[PDB]
Design a protein around this nucleic acid. Structure first.
Lengths: 238, 227
DNA sequence: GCCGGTTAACCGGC
DNA sequence: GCCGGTTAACCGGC
């Protein structure tokens, strides 16, 4: 992680600051890691400007030089082709990372989550378990196991004042422990502070291991659906 | 529908929720009928000070289906004395007359945007609902209708859920198992008893649940199996 | 503690 | 046209 070596300072500077503290975190990185800090859409824009001679989606989809990167970063075909110095990319919540850290072609997909301590703890949607599945399949089909890391920074607040923060990395957690809430848009849910960080194997093992977990949960869920949405309603079908 | 008769009036000459307007108009012409859910709850209790146990304030609903669709839950009802408007309510607007309830949902649509069916109601919840209905013979207790408002107010629409063909309700399982549709596209030619509707809905739900179970093996299992 | 259903909408592939 | 996955979080039952 590019930001871990300076996570302590972020924690310090944030604790006390008076829902989107995301902006304050971004502002920070921009001042301490100016050469590495990009918003995802900024990155795409900058990448397209360096090559004004390359137009059309299929062509601009080549500029990534990585099928996993293309998958995690690229916008829709129409949007890519309609991109121009005149018609640039803007925010877009559906963008994978909230903050992109790049260096030596290594990418840290950082997301910033915020929780309202006052409220009763409720694990938020962290990411699509399917999207993660596909992502893991790309890493293997293409053998890209040393390209990006998916990390999270959490900022706890109350009535708004930041009271504390947390920092964890997805690829350092036990893939078999990730909770997949199928009803909630098949999204993994957890609190950064509660994320397990003891994975010992390689990034490829993780990828494989996650798939086993995803596939296994999808099997179980298919069955539990008959359990919860079929059996208890047989009564009335006569 | 207590609103249907005046649905012609909910639009004349005018001069991002336009839901306020929808509520104020109903309050004006159907004052002694129109109320918000949180506001209505305040009444049921404010008309009964003697009751305080959360298991008592519950039986006041004098209906197991209504209780299911309208109650706020133990802790919430127990700590009553306010009841804020919680988007978690079943309906945005409620209208009762002679022991009958019209549960109205007000949807607004950004017309300029690309047509994307929005979440209407949880298919699962609607299943439990039909269950309570049938096992309670309460097929003449309430209606679940919808009023949609387009804008860029370009136009509006109004439909009744218990008036559409069940088999046509698209249950988008990934999107929190919610039925999706724009009011203006909802089917409106169902012919049968209300009890017929509920039963028909359950068949559709169960069948779709099985179809989803199957879909999961082919889209989330089959293609990742190899690894 | 443990557990998982619900908001209001919103694209992009083919 | 036709189809369905994604946001950022949020809460009550036993």
């Amino acid at each position: 992680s590019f930001i871990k070596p300076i996570y302590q300072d972020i924690n310090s500077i944030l604790i006390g600051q008076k829902e989107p503290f995301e902006k304050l975190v971004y502002k920070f990185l921009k001042e301490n890691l100016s050469d590495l800090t990009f918003k995802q859409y900024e990155y795409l824009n900058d990448l397209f400007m360096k090559n004004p001679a390359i137009i059309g989606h299929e062509a601009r989809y080549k500029l990534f030089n990585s099928p996993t990167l293309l998958f995690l970063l690229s916008r829709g075909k129409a949007a890519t082709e309609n991109w121009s110095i005149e018609n640039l990319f803007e925010e877009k919540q559906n963008d994978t990372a909230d903050i992109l850290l790049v260096k030596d072609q290594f990418y840290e997909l950082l997301d910033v989550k915020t929780r309202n301590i006052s409220k009763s703890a409720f694990a938020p949607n962290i990411i699509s378990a399917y999207k993660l599945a596909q992502t893991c399949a790309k890493m293997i089909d293409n053998k890209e196991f040393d390209l990006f890391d998916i990390n999270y920074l959490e900022v706890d607040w109350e009535l708004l004042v930041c009271v504390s923060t947390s920092f964890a990395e997805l690829f350092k957690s036990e893939p078999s422990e990730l909770y997949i809430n199928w009803a909630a848009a098949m999204q993994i849910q957890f609190h950064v502070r509660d994320l397990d960080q003891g994975f010992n194997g390689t990034r490829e093992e993780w990828a494989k291991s996650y798939l086993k977990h995803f596939v296994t949960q999808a099997e179980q869920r298919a069955i539990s659906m008959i359990d919860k949405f079929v059996k208890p309603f047989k009564k009335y079908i006569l």
